[PDB]
Amino acid sequence: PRYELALILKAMQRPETAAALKRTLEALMDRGAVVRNLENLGERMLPYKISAHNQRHSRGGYFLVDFYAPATTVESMMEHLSRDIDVIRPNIVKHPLTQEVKECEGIVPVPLEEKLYSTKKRK
C-alpha cells in the first residue's frame, strides 16, 4: 500500500457515518485513487478537544484508508477534505509498509575515546 488516510470524523449515528465515508472514497476514486481497505478504529473520546468548522468536539470516529494515488494528486484530496463539513481532522501519510525494516543487528558498543589529549608528564 502507498498512502494512508487518517480520518477523524464527527461522531454521528450509523447512516450519516456511512454517507460520509462513502462520499469520501468517492472523492478519492475521482481524483484517480485505488482504494485498498477501510479500517474502523472505533469511536473514541479524543485525547483532547478539537475545534473545526465552528464546532468544538470531544469525541470522534476513527478511520484508516489505504490507497494508491499519483504524486500530483495528494494536495487535491487534502483540499477537498479540509473543505468537508463533517471531517474533524484529515491526514495523509506515506503508508507505514513502504518503509523498510533494516535489522538492528544490536547495540554496537561504543569504547571510550582515547588519544584526545597529548601525553604530558604534568605535575
Partner: protein, 49 residues
Amino acid sequence: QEVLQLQEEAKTFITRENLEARVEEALDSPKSYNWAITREGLVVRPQQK
C-alpha cells in the same frame, strides 16, 4: 513475485460497487492496532474479550 502479489490483491480491492458492502462491513468489525511490549521483548496484545 511482486506482480503476482498485486494480482492477488486486485481481487480484494475496493471498487465502485463494493463500497456498499465494504463500508457496511467496516462499521461492523472494528479493528485495533493497539499493541504493547514486555521487558523480555515479548508482546502482549489486548486481553481477550
